[PDB]
């Protein structure tokens, strides 16, 4: 006589409710972290948004590869329960320590004098690459905030999700997980903006962004502990299926040719192609957008309030479009839904670049909407990222996870951990490498925006050419 509250069994409810509530808390922290990490490195003194091309390739990329190897080594020395804590607790300690301890000490540990000497000896083109050494502690926060979205959002959660959840519940409640975790963006974006509004209490003296950063990093710990408490509960009071595997345990002792196995497949060879094409294109657009952001919001608090507003808008757009996807998929197909994201990103990016390039003459409409050309660029790039990233979260990520179904059950576990951890940073680092070569070749990033559009078309025209290759092979493992 098991009850079926809301038509859903009360035994599965004890498994799904704390799981979507966890993914709510996980994306609540990431919304604070991924917003603060941009406020931290872009609006610092002596740094610009041109640090981002160099942050992602030389700092964020090898630390993601370094974490992959450490997490893979940690997977075969700790239990599944212990592996979750030993990955997520150091994140909680770091962000809590950064708010309360490491950020106030930044003025003591940041070599602002040695970097200003490098800036003169090496010139204006190198403000970006030198800025990594100025605010290296803020650059470490950047990679840790980047690793939260790649490990906690993707590896830690979905690894625990796909373990306790059956295939039938994963087809019914996973779409609800994204819906409830975009309410997290709406609420954490309001949280980022609320705690970014300068108190104006004690206008002189105490840093306004310091009290802002301490309040938010306190929530990151509190909402991060909620992830650990929601994890302790499902593992103690919810029956774990321990579903029987089909393969032997003999696949082991692989640390270097696991990558060779993962690249031998012409299937993962196109999954990774899509996961890099997105990330290359998104970087190519968003680094320029964030340069416009720094030009428009120079103080950390203005930038953080705008990032909170932008996070709320991203949450609402992604909620709407995750509601629309569950009709787009059924009506059209995987191949059309895999075309929507590259096309929307390409069109939004070319519209943004054709406003940075060919909008100066078309200033009449910019003034008509009561804006400056820079504010118009800021809002157009904000819409670019909102549309592209909501499109991702609602069709590309569903298309990605709807392609791992016809595989082995051990290739997928360490394959879409690999794909995430070293293909999202890999794609964004490829885009960042393009942008940083163009920075060191043409001086500023503003001189490089005509060539950003040509490269954007090349990556997208292969993004579609690789989705069709995966489509013609996602269709051929079906009737």
């Amino acid at each position, epitope marked *: 006589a098991s009850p079926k509250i809301f038509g859903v069994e009360v035994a599965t409810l004890k498994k799904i409710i704390p799981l979507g509530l966890m993914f709510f808390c996980i994306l609540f922290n990431y919304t604070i972290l991924r917003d603060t990490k941009d406020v931290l490195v872009v609006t610092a003194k002596g740094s610009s948004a*041109e640090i981002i091309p160099f942050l992602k390739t030389w700092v964020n990329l090898p630390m993601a590869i370094g974490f992959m190897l450490l997490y893979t080594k940690l997977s075969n020395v700790l239990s599944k329960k212990a592996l979750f804590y030993t990955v997520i607790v150091p994140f909680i300690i770091y962000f809590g320590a950064f708010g309360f301890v490491m950020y106030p000490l930044s003025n003591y540990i940041h070599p602002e004098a040695l970097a200003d000497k490098l800036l003169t000896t090496l*010139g*204006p083109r190198f403000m970006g690459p030198i800025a990594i050494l100025r605010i290296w502690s803020f650059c470490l926060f950047y990679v840790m905030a980047e690793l939260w979205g790649s490990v906690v959002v993707s590896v830690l959660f979905w690894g625990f999700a796909n373990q306790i959840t059956t295939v039938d519940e994963a087809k019914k409640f996973y779409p609800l997980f994204g819906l409830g975790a975009n309410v997290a963006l709406i609420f954490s974006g309001r949280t980022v903006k609320y705690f970014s509004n300068l108190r104006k209490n004690l206008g002189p003296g105490v840093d306004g962004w310091a009290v802002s950063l301490k309040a938010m990093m306190s929530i990151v710990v509190g909402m991060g502990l909620a992830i650990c408490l929601l994890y302790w509960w499902v593992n103690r009071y919810v029956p774990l299926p321990t579903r029987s595997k089909n393969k032997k345990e003999k696949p082991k002792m692989g640390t270097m040719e696991s990558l060779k196995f993962l690249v031998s497949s012409p299937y993962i060879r196109d999954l990774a192609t899509l996961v890099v094409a997105y990330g290359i294109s998104i970087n190519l657009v968003e680094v320029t957008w964030k340069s416009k952001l720094k030009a428009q919001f120079p103080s950390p608090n203005e930038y953080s309030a705008f990032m909170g507003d932008f996070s709320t808008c991203t949450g609402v757009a992604t909620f709407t479009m995750m509601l629309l996807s569950q009709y787009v998929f059924n009506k059209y197909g995987w191949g059309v839904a895999a075309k929507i994201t590259p096309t929307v990103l390409l069109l939004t990016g070319v519209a943004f670049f054709s406003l940075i390039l060919f909008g100066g003459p078309f200033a009449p409409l910019v003034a008509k909407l009561g804006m400056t050309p820079l504010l118009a660029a800021v809002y157009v790039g904000a819409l670019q990222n909102i549309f592209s990233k909501s499109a991702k979260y609602s069709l590309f990520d569903p298309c990605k996870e709807m392609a791992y179904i016809p595989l082995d059950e051990d290739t997928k576990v360490k394959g879409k951990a690999a794909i995430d951890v070293v293909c999202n940073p890999l794609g964004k680092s490829g885009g960042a490498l393009i942008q940083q070569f163009m920075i060191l070749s043409f001086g500023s990033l503003a001189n490089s925006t005509p060539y950003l559009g040509m490269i954007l078309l090349v990556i997208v025209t292969a993004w579609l050419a690789a989705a069709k290759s995966l489509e013609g092979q996602f269709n051929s493992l079906r009737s």
Partner: nanobody
Amino acid sequence: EVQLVESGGGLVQAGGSLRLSCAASGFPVDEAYMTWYRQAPGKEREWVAAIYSSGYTRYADSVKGRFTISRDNSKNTVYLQMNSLKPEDTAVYYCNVKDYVYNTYLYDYWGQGTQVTVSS
């Protein structure tokens, strides 16, 4: 076609204030690395202040805290606000747009300078 014209220099008492103006033509000042130099008769040209396209400001130790370099994008002008002027600040101040990589100077455009004199 790049030109820099300086203005605002003049006589002030010790401890007074001035605002040197740099009207630039042929390039946007927000995309440029702008600097203020000063040269007094009998001494070599001395770098005073610098502003970057990112808005980052750098100052010499002798003027740090008293001088402030900024720019107006709409006017395409670079300003040097000189407060608490000492008699040792008397020099011809040059505004300069510049670009270089390590020691290869891609372009280097100067102004004709403006005289700043601090009385005693």
